[PDB]
Tab-separated table of C-alpha atoms in Angstrom:
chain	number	residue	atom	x	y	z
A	125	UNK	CA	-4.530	-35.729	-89.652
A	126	UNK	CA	-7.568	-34.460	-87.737
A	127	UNK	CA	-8.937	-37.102	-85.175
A	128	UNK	CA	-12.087	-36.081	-83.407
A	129	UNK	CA	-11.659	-38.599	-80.868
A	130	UNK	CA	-8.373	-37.102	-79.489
A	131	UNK	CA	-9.416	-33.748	-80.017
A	132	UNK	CA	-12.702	-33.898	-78.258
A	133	UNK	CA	-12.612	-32.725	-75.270
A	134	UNK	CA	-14.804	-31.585	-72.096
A	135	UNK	CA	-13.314	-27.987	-70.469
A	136	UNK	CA	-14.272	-27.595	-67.023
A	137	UNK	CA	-14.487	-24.489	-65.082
A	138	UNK	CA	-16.499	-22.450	-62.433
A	139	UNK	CA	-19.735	-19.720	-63.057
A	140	UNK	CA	-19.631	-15.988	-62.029
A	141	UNK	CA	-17.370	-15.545	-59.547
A	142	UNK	CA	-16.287	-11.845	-59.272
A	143	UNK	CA	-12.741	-10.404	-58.348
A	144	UNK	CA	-11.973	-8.181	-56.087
A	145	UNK	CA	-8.598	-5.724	-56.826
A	146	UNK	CA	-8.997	-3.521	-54.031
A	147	UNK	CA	-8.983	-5.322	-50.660
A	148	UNK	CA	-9.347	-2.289	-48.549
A	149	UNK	CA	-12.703	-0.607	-49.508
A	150	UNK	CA	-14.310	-3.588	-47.636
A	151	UNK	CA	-12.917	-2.216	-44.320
A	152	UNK	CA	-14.980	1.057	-42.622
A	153	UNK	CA	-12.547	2.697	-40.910
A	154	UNK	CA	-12.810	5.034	-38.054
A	155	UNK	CA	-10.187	6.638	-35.214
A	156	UNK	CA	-10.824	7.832	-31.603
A	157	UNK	CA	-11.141	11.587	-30.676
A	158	UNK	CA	-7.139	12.323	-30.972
A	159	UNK	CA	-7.278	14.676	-27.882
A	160	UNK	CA	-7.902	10.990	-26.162
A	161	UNK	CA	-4.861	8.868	-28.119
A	162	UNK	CA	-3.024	6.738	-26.215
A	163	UNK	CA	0.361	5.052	-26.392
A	164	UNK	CA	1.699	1.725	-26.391
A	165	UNK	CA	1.034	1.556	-22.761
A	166	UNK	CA	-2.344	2.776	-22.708
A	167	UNK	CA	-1.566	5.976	-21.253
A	168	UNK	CA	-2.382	9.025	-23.407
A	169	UNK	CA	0.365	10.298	-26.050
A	170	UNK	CA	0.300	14.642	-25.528
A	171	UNK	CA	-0.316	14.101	-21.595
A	172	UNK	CA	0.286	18.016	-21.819
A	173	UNK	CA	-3.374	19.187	-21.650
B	252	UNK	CA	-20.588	3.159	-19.760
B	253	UNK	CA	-21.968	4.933	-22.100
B	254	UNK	CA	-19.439	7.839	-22.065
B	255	UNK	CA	-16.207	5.706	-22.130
B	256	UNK	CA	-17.869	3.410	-24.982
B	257	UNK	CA	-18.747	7.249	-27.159
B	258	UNK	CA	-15.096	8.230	-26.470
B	259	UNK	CA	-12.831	4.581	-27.169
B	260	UNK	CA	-15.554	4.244	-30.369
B	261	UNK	CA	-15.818	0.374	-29.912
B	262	UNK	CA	-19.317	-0.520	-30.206
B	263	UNK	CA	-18.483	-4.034	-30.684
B	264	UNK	CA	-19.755	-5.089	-27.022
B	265	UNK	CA	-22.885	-3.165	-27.265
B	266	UNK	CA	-23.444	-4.921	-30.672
B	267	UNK	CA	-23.130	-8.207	-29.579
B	268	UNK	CA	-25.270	-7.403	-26.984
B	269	UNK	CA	-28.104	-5.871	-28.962
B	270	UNK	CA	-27.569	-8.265	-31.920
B	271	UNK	CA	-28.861	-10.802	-29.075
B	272	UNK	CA	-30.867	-10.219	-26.294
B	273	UNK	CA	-29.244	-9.967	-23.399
B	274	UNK	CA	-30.390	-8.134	-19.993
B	275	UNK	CA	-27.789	-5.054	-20.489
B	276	UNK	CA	-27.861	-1.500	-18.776
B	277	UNK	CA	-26.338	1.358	-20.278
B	278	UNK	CA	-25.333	3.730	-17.797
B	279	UNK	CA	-24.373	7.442	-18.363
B	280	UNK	CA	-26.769	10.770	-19.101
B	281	UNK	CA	-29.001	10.809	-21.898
B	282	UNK	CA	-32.395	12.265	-22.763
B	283	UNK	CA	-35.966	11.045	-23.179
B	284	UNK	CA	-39.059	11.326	-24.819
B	285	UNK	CA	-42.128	11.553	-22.641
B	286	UNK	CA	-44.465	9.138	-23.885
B	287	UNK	CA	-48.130	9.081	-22.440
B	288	UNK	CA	-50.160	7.046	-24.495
B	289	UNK	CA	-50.966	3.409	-23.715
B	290	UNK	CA	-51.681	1.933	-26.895
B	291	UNK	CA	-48.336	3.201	-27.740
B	292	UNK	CA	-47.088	1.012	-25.025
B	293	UNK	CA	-49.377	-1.792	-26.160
B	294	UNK	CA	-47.289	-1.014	-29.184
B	295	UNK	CA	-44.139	-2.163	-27.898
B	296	UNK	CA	-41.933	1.183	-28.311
B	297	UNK	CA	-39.664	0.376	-25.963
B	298	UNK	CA	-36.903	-1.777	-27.825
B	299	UNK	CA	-37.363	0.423	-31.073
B	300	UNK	CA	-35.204	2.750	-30.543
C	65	UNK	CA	-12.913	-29.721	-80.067
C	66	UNK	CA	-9.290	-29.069	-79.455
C	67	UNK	CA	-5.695	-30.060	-80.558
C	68	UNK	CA	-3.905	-32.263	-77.639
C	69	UNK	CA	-1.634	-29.235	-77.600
C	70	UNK	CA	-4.277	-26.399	-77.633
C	71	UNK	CA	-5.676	-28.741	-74.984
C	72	UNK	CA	-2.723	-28.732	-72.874
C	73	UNK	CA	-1.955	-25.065	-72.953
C	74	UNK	CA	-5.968	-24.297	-72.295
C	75	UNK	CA	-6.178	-27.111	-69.554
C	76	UNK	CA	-3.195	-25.339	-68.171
C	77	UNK	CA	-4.862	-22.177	-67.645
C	78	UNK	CA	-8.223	-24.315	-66.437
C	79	UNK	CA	-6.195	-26.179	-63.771
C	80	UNK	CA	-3.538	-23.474	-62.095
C	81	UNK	CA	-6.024	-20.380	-61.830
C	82	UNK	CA	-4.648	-17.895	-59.413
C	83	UNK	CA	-8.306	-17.014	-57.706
C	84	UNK	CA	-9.457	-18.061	-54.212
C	85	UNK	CA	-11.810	-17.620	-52.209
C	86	UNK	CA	-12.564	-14.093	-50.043
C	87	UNK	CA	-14.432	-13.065	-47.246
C	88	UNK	CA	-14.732	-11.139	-43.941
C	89	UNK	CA	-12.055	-13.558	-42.795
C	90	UNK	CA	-9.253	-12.762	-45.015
C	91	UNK	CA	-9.789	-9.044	-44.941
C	92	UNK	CA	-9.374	-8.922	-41.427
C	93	UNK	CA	-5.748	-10.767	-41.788
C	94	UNK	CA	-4.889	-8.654	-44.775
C	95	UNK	CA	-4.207	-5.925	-42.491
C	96	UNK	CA	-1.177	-5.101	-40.548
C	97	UNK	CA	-0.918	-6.499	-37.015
C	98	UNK	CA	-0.361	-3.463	-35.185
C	99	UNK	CA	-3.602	-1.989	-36.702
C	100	UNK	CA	-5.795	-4.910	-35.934
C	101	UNK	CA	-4.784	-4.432	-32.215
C	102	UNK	CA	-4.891	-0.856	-31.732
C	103	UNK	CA	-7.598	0.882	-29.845
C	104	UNK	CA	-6.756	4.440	-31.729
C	105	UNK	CA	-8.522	2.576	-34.905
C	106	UNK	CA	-11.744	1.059	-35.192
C	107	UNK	CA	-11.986	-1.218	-38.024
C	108	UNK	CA	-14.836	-3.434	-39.073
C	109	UNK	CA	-17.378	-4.992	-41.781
C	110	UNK	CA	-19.760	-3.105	-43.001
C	111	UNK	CA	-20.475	-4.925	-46.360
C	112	UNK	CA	-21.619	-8.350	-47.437
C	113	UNK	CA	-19.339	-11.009	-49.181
């Protein structure tokens, strides 16, 4: 049988939070000139020119 | 530099250098306006840019 | 006003929410290691969280 003191209850939760699914549109994203790459080691990758 | 700093792309040292104010001298070939007025240098154009 | 069932089952999804907190500081780890020190790349933040 229906009891509305142990049914009663306060919920608690936050307000407006907003997820994010992407992750990686957050991040601008540039590269060097790739005749000036480099290695590892610093030194330039196609040393050829 | 300002030449090594266009061609590595970092702009991270420059920005926390401009972000604040610190005494900083970029070195490396570059144009200029020729200003001549002096209430335009009562108006403090220099930092503006 | 809920059933002590409907209350566990709802307080259950109140409690254990899977959602935490982001910003510029998570973003940054969420990338790969040999990205985040690599001088070919130039990541950053260019938006608010």
């Amino acid at each position: 049988q229906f009891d509305f003191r142990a049914s009663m209850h306060m919920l608690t939760s936050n307000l407006t939070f907003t997820v994010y699914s992407d992750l990686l549109a957050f991040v601008s994203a540039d590269t060097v000139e790739p005749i000036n790459a480099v290695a590892f080691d610093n030194m330039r990758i196609m040393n050829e020119l | 530099n300002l030449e090594e700093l266009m061609r590595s792309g970092d702009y991270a040292q420059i920005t926390n250098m401009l972000l604040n104010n610190q005494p900083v001298a970029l070195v490396g070939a570059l144009p200029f306006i020729t200003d001549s007025s002096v209430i335009s240098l009562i108006a403090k154009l220099d930092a503006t840019v | 006003i809920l059933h002590p069932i409907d209350h566990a089952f709802n307080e259950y999804f109140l409690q254990h929410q899977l959602v935490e907190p982001l910003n510029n500081d998570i973003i940054f780890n969420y990338i790969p290691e040999r990205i985040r020190n690599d001088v070919n790349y130039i990541l950053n933040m260019d938006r608010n969280l």
